Amino acid sequence: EHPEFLKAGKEPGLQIWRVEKFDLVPVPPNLYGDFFTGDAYVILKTVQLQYDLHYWLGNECSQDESGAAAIFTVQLDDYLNGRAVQHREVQGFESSTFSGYFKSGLKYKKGGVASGF
Amino acid sequence: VQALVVDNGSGNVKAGVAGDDAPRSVFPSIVGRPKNDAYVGDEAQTKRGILTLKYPIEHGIVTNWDDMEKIWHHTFYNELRAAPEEHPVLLTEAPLNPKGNRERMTQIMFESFNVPAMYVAIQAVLSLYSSGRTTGIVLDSGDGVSHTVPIYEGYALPHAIMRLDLAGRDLTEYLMKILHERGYGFSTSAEKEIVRDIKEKLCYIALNFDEEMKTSEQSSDIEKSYELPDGNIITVGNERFRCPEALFQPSFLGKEAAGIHTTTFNSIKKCDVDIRKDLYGNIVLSGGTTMYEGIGERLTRDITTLAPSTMKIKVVAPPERKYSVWIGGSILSSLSTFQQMWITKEEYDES
Ligand SMILES: Nc1ncnc2c1ncn2[C@@H]1O[C@H](COP(=O)(O)OP(=O)(O)O)[C@@H](O)[C@H]1O
Ligand SMILES: [Ca+2]
Ligand SMILES: [Ca+2]
Ligand SMILES: [K+]
Ligand SMILES: [Mg+2]
Structure with missing residues (x-):
């Protein structure tokens, strides 16, 4: 029933959410590829349907954010009938597949949304 | 709500x-x-x-x-x-x-x-999530029980969960026992709480047990003191690392059980070969009995010895793992x- 689950994985493409106060909040598309080092994110890549879920952990994100990113990843996978492959992505050590989703490459920014804790 | x-x-x-x-x-x-x-x-x-x-x-x-x-x-x-x-x-x-x-x-x-x-x-699943992971093996050592719990993509693998046959209470009791060598007679329930605090404050895990026994005997550098509730001071020497060594050598307690390194290895081996790399690379400690200084480095040495040499062993020791x-x-x-x-x-x- 979570609105963003209802949107997940319907069309080929790239969906990015940021953990914000224990919720999954869409990232504005103009910011795709820039990642706040203070935050954690969930990324669903859909291919025409194949699913790859990556959860990206900034070096300064708080424990509530990285934990929620892990749990939301599991919940999204279950919503997709277990069909997604899950990938943990740590800032600066991301997989070549994850980096490959962004034409301009991965970049990082200082700051982030406040911890829910 | x-x-x-x-x-x-x-x-x-x-x-x-x-x-x-x-x-x-x-x-x-x-x-x-x-x-x-x-x-x-x-x-x-x-x-x-x-x-x-x-x-x-x-x-x-x-x-x-x-x-x-x-x-x-x-x-x-x-x-x-x-x-x-x-x-x-x-x-x-x-x-x-x-x-x-x-x-x-x-x-x-x-x-x-x-x-x-x-x-x-x-x-153990909650601990894994608190570490920011969906896949790993959690080694949860608490007061009366320890377990190794492989988890893949969010879900524990029930056929691979093992029980390690000792926990923190066993260690407190073992410290109580070996302190009789120095002449201490802690035995009541209230003295046991004292010895628990001594264990938490002074104990540590040797990187190499045999080498630590050798180096500790060569001087008094090992000895460290603790103030009892009645103001008396107790001094503890090699008991500091012999006590938690029982996690690795349960024979010290008179148990035939495998130690935590062997148990973690056996637990990973129960999982199919195609997922073991992700377990070996995400060994997550949780619980109070994983709080000993030196545990991550010792566990890394010992699991690396047991595991195939193509595996990448990573032991993760979160600072707030006592409550993970x-x-x-x-x-x-x-x-x-x-x-x-x-x-x-x-x-x-x-x-
Ligand atoms: N800093 C410490 N070093 C070693 N052991 C500790 C430390 N802190 C707590 N413990 C031991 O951890 C056990 C409690 O751990 P916990 O994870 O809370 O157990 P449980 O969940 O089974 O109640 C006790 O045996 C306690 O003495
Ligand atoms: Ca943040
Ligand atoms: Ca899946
Ligand atoms: K080996
Ligand atoms: Mg517990």
Whole structure:
């Protein structure tokens, strides 16, 4: 029933959410590829349907954010009938597949949304 | 409404409110009843003279439901001051807890405490989530039980969960024993709490046990002191690392059981070969008995020796791992999706 689950994985493409106060909040598309080092994110890549879920952990994100990113990843996978492959992505050590989703490459920014804790 | 998070520990209950970064209530999992009503936790220890004291969840499995219900009533009313009938509750359970035990706890929560919604979580899964992972093997060593729990893509692999046959209480008892070499005679329940504090304050895990025995004998550098409640000072030497060495060599306790390194290895081997790399690369420590200085480096050496040399061994020792079960529960129960995960009392009562 979570609105963003209802949107997940319907069309080929790239969906990015940021953990914000224990919720999954869409990232504005103009910011795709820039990642706040203070935050954690969930990324669903859909291919025409194949699913790859990556959860990206900034070096300064708080424990509530990285934990929620892990749990939301599991919940999204279950919503997709277990069909997604899950990938943990740590800032600066991301997989070549994850980096490959962004034409301009991965970049990082200082700051982030406040911890829910 | 804000959920309540209750980690039913073999030695101490951790309890609090969803969204906090640590439990606000930590108290011993003990019930005291008159020798010739019931007291729980610290109150029961203060009155050990006039009470018979019992552990209802000695090894992580509830064995006395009347006493366990007293612990839960103490949690809600004396510790949290929360009406259980007005909050969702997340309760933790041990790995491999029988379904009939989960069903009895659920019955007590819905029918005695009238909780409006409940979710039961596996302790080690919560710890893994608190580390920011969906795949790994958790080595949870608490007071009366330890387990190794492989988890893949969010879910424990039940056929691979192992029990390590000792825990923190066994270590306190072993320190009590070996301190007789120096002439100490700690034996009462109250002295045991002293020795537990000595263990937590002074013990450490040797990187190489045999080498540490050799180097420790060559000087008094090993000796460290502790002030007893009566102001006397005790000095401890090689007992500092011989005590937690029993996690690796249970034969020190007269047990035939495998040590925590061997157990972790066996646990990973139960999982299919195509996922072992991700387990070896995400060995996550949790629980109070993983708090010893030196544990991560020793465990890395020992598991690396046992494991195929193509594997990449990574032991993760989060600083707040003593409470990582409870923290993982606090995160999960704070999520915007938690309301879809729980069971309501109305559903249960009509099931
Ligand atoms: N700093 C420490 N070093 C070693 N052992 C510790 C430390 N802190 C706590 N312990 C031990 O951890 C055990 C409690 O761990 P915990 O994870 O809370 O157990 P449980 O969940 O089974 O109640 C006790 O045996 C305690 O003495
Ligand atoms: Ca943040
Ligand atoms: Ca999957
Ligand atoms: K090896
Ligand atoms: Mg525990």
